[PDB]
Write a structure and sequence with these properties.
The structure is a homotetramer. In chain A, strands 7-6-14-15-19-13-20-17 form an 8-stranded mixed β-sheet. In chain A, strands 1, 2, 9, 10, 11, 12 and 21 form a 7-stranded mixed β-sheet that branches. In chain A, strands 3-4 form a two-stranded antiparallel sheet. In chain A, strand 1, helix 1 and strand 2 form a beta-alpha-beta unit. Chain A has a single domain, classed as 3-Layer(bba) Sandwich (FAD/NAD(P)-binding domain), CATH 3.50.50. Helices cover about 30% and strands about 20% of the residues of chain A. Chain A has 14 helices and 21 strands. By secondary structure, chain A is of the alpha+beta class. At the A-B interface, helix 11 of A face helix 12 of B. The structure holds flavin-adenine dinucleotide. Flavin-adenine dinucleotide binds next to helix 1, strand 2, strand 20 and helix 11 of chain A. Chain B: InterPro entries: FAD/NAD-bd_sf.
């Protein structure tokens, strides 16, 4: 008999695993335990802090929630109104000196007139083709052109997605975008050209990763195992037993694995699965943070992401992270020396001066098809912020952050579903629910609300026979209000 | 304080309520009791038997492994079921046209084949440039079949079924399959002279060996704890007080609940709630009544009848819309050959030679005739008019000897998918939901397309699963989703019951 | 035997009849004579002059090098003609919108631009899956422009022209060009805010005499003795069975083949044929009021170098206006001519009845009349002058020195849905009796009813009588209009091979 | 001044040139003369006779006349009722042992049921594509498949046209087929599957008897046929042509009916020689077989052969057209060979009756033809296609090869042609005809006859050359205006 024995074992305490844990803890039926190699729960949804006191999310923030169950877990973890800030859900595209509001096509009235013509002409061609279309598009690129036409495709969605995915649009599938038919709204785009013409909540303290620390605090501490004591090293699927760094063995009846599915295959010493997982493609992500002295720029004022399709900066999206919360960066009274100016030069005084401060966060993608010079990427990003007029050449940088995440994005390549329906059934037959951004490799359910629910539904499947709707039918869950599953169900009321 | 109090109360023990019961009993969490005014479980899915021993139902295909687990529990021996191919035909112009109708029009006159194919070319070319969804049932038919084939079968037949025109019915209930024709399939079978039907060795169904269909539900209900049931006059509901969450029975016993699953017809529920708003709305729903007529025949089954199973009648020469050779489904649906029965009449109406009781063997026909305000039915002659229709459709020779007759009329037969149905229904169910009432079933939730036995059984399962485990009511709200997949996740033994040992 | 006998007899010396005559005179084979009830050749293509010296026609574009040859012969010096760019506008919502209308809707309010483009997007998407031809003129319009652009111009305007709704007219007469929109063209000028018209693209106009001066010159090339114009040449009876026509003075002309240029309904009456009279009475037509206005001053800049103007709106009775004074300085008196002001544009009396000098300019208007849209003969002149003020062509203070008003009973032969059904009963019957009934009202087909087409109807009718040539213009308008017709010339091989 | 001087000079007395001659002679205005290197008028529409008494047309027969003017000229040449035989217009395709009536697609009910399915399946695909098409077809092959679908294209029109033209269908244009939109009549094809107008021919002389008769109506002295009238030099700049014998004929306008590449050579005009050499054309082998017996148990038509089992693309039972196309039954002839290739037993001259088959095989730079074996290969082909029994007795054979047979409607043809003909137009040369202007679609006899008439009508009377420039226009109407007796002649 092994060291510890449980019914369902949860590996990993990012959002997926915490979902699995929260539902196991709600049901309070089968015994369970959650393990993670990091002392701090939250996975890639965590928040780092520089030596100078600037916070940086690793893996974005939730701008829309699809599940009342997700909301119920957040409300429990952070229950006071002074725990959250409310911001308008907006975003902009940086295109030819302009900040073009989202969605890009409804705002091309900001571009030069001659360029509007090329855009509308392309969309007319798409609209007429769409009138006689009788096939689904097969590649992401096909989807883009059928939706936007060539003009708008080339200005934003084509170059932007190469910077994001680090593979061409011609090599990616498009089922992941949803079942909305790939046609343009010519009347809307043209009308806005002719005329010349909804919130989210963010944690007040802790950054996004503070949510998951708070959520994890609701679990019984004795049923958790975080840090070096809980790193998994071997998974023996045949004896349903897991071995840890310190040699502790955990036997299970059913297993929810949240770790990257290729790492699971390596830890299983299963060469069939290793061969399969190596067919999956992914990009790595450089997260770069820049802390600046001063008040923020006038023209980049609200709490959003910014998209950069153009060649004059390495990053694909940036956010003025200091707008999300005053607690993401130091008080103005804190004294910090200027490390450098934005143009690259050393400062006048190395004296520690007061604030106030603001903060920019960037993302650069890397893959085998788009390599990245690691030694210059931070400087190249800072130059890009000067090129996009987000920093003046004279701005004082007081903090820099740069971390590289090997598994950044799971790529929706053409080959992905073919590979994945060989992997997930094979692990299913061994009683392993591999779920998550990299547990099941589907980006379109890979943000925080979807990932959290992948783990809830996986447990709901193990105990209560529920359908894994998020795992298998994203457009279904994304197209409805999921109000049925709640943190207090009938099952708990009736006891 | 009331007489009995439970967490979830199920009204009605037809397939829907038994689903609710099977799942409440599986979970074994909150207390419950199921009531029905009928001493015999099964509701309108039960089986009658004539004084002469002929059984008559009021046919399955299973979309859920949960349904399979419960049937396999109720009737577990291989000798409890018979397996048959899904054989069906359309009676059209002297021919038995195999289903699907459009793939077999090679049996009609050549000049008529030309009109059919011409209609379908027009449909195929329109479908190539279509950019709207069909809005009425009639629209859907013509886009699928073209004018010719629509007029021969699906237009007239559905009027006999539903007793309303195809132009006054919606079509979301048929699915999201785009309304286009397979011109090549239709055209190829015409060219080849081929006659192939939509059945085969794996296109089968199972039927209960004994008891008829209603024997399934007797068996299913037998697995429940008897003390948690209340069937018969002792279980008729008369008042449902939604505001104090208590229902009153025939004998005056009061049952108080925390959640209510109502399998009774929603117009009757509204009446029993003394709620004039809800009653007003339910009276806006449309429905037709159904006459079931059974005929027992002396002889071995005719070669003309064959292995046939259901038959469709779009034409004017008989009152019924569907017929079944019920005697092919099971040898136990009619008496042994050694049983002696007198001939009651011949199919042409004349008296037999002797009133003597002669032996069999026997065979059995079941018919269905619909009645509504726009299509009335003479209660006093429909049986005779049905038997004449059997002679006209060449199912009986004038000389066949009839040894048993059956006729029952069911007030609530089909809930009609009218254009107005969803408009009304989305006012009723939210109102009943706010009073903590899950009205589910063929008439509990009034949606025909999830109204056969497997869907309704699961309507009650999912309603219980929603009440307890926050599951989505997928069958109730997304019929095309459940119908397009194999529903393997919910099983009669889930993890929750395994992990309790 | 009758009084005169010829091989081909041409009745009427409008452009159609003069065509037949020019060709009969060229071939110089069969004998012929041309007759007309008007002492002045040119028919409804003539030019009137007011007592005060302002000329008024009732604009050419030539599809035939033969047409050019006859004009170039009649008026051969360069100073017999003036050259102008093809400049026309639509008066719409206070703006002069350059033609073609749809390429210039950028002058309309933005909210209205949206309705137009949205209507044209619908039109383009329908056109992408169209598999039928339009059946009515209205159908043709909407398929070309969409609802929005159709309602602003081509629908209301064509009603003012034809005095029948566009749904009751056919559209084969517009040609075989597919009825689809150039959405990219329209949408691009809206985005850029551009305006441009379809004018290096010129037309020529006679320097003196107006348009009817062309036809005077052309008629002068004929042998005088082969004509009979005036009261002496009015035809009163046409006896189709004895192939003889009798004149006002009782003179009988015998013919072997007859080219009748007069209105075919009058032809049926003069043939005393009750079957044909019934058939011709089935044809529909509209009457035309021509109104001329002479104004004092140098021409205003608001008018500019404009030429014809189209008026789809309800605020003036006329459908088209012409700045006749821009075509030629000799269409109105010199500045040194002295004339009294008759009235101001607002209706009031002038200060003095003294005759002041010029310069002058000249406006010409057209108003249509039919049983479906009547016209008050007693007020139309005043209603027109008010229309000029409402459309900002005249300021209320502009001084009018000449007014002109003539009404033409047979103005436009209407391309109704029923026209060809009727016409394919009338023309074969008159053909079997050896009568080539050709022309704007001789054959009643508007789309070949302007001057170059009509002149050639007469030429081709003769070429058919003598040389078995195909009557291409009469029967295949889109064919002749879609090509350059360089083969027939005023000097053919037959004439070179005889000198 | 040269030896002869006339206003219009016509080179060649095929149907085109005789058209030009008939109209010049009717107008009777400008002086004119017509020359031909052949003593016998009719060009490639003439009729040969074997030493054994069997007639064979060189260049087919007219099955429909588009112009009342053509009819008037025929009616003059042969005015008696018993000068003509009247037969039904019809043709068949030999496909998988069946004689499939024309048009092929409306009669596929004769093919096996399984082959009908692929035909109809292919045509449904074509019908659905046509419903959303917005481009015209660009190649002949595009036209075929859009009209017939793949199945029916592969059984007949694709393989048949490769045997006719000796180029792939993908390398030919399709404007020459007309303005009829490239869509299928699916309902018609399907309805006939579900359910399951004459021409006249000369009684004597074969087709070439028409042109001898039409030519007989001309004034003899204005003609010059034979070695005396072969043209050897064309000096377009001094408007003079030189003959075989050194005679010079000077002209004011020239109607050239000879093949335009030969005209370019006689002009010693290297610009034109280079341009004409870009035109593609195929040669034709005409093969006749005279057989002993009565005809096999049909009627007077052409037969089309898309399949691999015979070299020829079309065959006709020429003997059905007229009894005078072959000897009387009382005529004695020895059997030359059997259809199987063997020589007969006796050199005995036996009686008839007789019948006659005429074949056509094409040859081009992409499709060579063994001149020494093609006759035997054709006779075998007649046995393979069940037109001859292996034992039928052949009493006469005919084989002549025509270098300029068909002018090929290649994709490049119009691009090349709009450089040649306008250049010759400026030199006052009307190069018209089957090879004078190289357009197959107006290369049959009525169109060619009218090419010459209209060319004269343009030179004299300024008429539009409608047939040369608008074949679909003339083909879609009845051309009744130009007649052999016009007003111009009545008024004199
Ligand atoms: C670059 C980036 C941008 C993002 N942007 C957004 C955004 O804009 N909006 C949004 O809503 N979401 C966003 N996210 C989503 C969010 O970061 C992820 O969904 C989150 O990581 C949830 O995935 P997960 O729990 O399945 O896996 P993870 O959180 O990646 O991993 C789960 C845990 O498993 C642990 N683990 C791995 N191997 C072992 C082992 N052997 N033993 C023990 N533990 C192990 C890991 O240490 C980790 O703690 C983004 C993510 C990234 C990477």
């Amino acid at each position: 008999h092994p060291d510890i024995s449980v019914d369902v074992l949860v590996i990993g305490a990012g959002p997926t695993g915490l979902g699995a844990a929260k539902r196991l803890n709600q049901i309070d039926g089968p015994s369970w335990m959650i393990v993670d190699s990091n002392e701090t729960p939250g996975g890639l949804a965590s928040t780092d802090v520089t030596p100078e006191g600037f916070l940086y999310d690793v893996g974005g923030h939730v701008i829309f929630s699809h599940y009342k169950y997700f909301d119920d877990c957040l409300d429990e973890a952070l229950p006071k109104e002074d725990d959250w800030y409310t911001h308008q859900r907006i975003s902009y595209v940086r295109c030819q000196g302009q900040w073009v509001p989202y969605p890009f096509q409804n705002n091309i009235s900001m571009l030069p007139k001659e360029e509007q013509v090329k855009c509308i002409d392309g969309m007319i061609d798409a609209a007429l083709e769409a009138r006689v279309a009788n096939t689904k598009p097969k590649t992401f690129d096909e989807w883009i052109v059928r939706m936007m036409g060539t003009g708008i495709a080339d200005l934003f969605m084509r170059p932007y997605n190469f910077k994001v995915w680090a593979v061409p649009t011609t090599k990616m599938q498009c089922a992941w975008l949803g079942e909305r038919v790939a046609a343009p709204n010519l009347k809307a785009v043209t009308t806005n050209v002719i005329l010349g013409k909804a919130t989210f909540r963010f944690p007040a303290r802790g950054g996004t990763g503070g949510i998951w620390i708070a959520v994890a605090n609701t679990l019984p501490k004795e049923k958790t195992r975080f840090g070096e004591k809980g790193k998994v090293t071997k998974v023996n699927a045949n004896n349903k037993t897991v071995t840890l760094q310190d040699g502790t063995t955990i036997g299970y009846k059913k297993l929810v694995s949240t770790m990257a599915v290729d790492f699971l295959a390596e830890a299983m010493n299963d060469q069939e699965l290793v061969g399969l997982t190596k067919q999956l493609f992914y990009s790595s992500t450089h997260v770069i943070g820049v802390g600046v002295r001063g008040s923020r720029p006038e023209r980049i004022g609200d709490k959003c992401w910014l998209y950069f399709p153009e060649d004059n900066c390495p990053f694909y999206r940036a956010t003025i992270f200091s707008n999300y919360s005053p607690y993401n960066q130091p008080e103005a009274s804190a004294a910090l020396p200027t490390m450098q100016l934005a143009d690259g030069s050393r400062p006048q005084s190395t004296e520690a001066k007061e604030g106030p401060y603001w903060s920019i966060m960037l993302e650069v993608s890397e893959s085998s098809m788009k390599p990245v010079n690691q030694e210059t990427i931070l400087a190249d990003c800072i130059q890009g912020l000067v090129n996009t007029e987000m920093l003046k050449p004279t701005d004082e940088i007081v903090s820099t952050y740069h971390r590289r995440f090997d598994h950044g994005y799971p790529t929706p390549t053409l080959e992905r579903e073919g590979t994945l329906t060989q992997i997930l059934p094979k692990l299913q037959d061994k009683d392993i629910w591999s779920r998550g951004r990299f547990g099941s490799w589907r980006y379109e359910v890979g943000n925080q609300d979807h990932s959290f629910m992948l783990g809830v539904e996986a447990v709901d499947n193990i105990v209560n026979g529920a359908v894994e709707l998020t795992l298998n039918y994203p457009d279904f869950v994304n197209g409805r209000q999921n109000t049925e599953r709640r943190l207090v169900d009938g099952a708990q009321v009736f006891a």
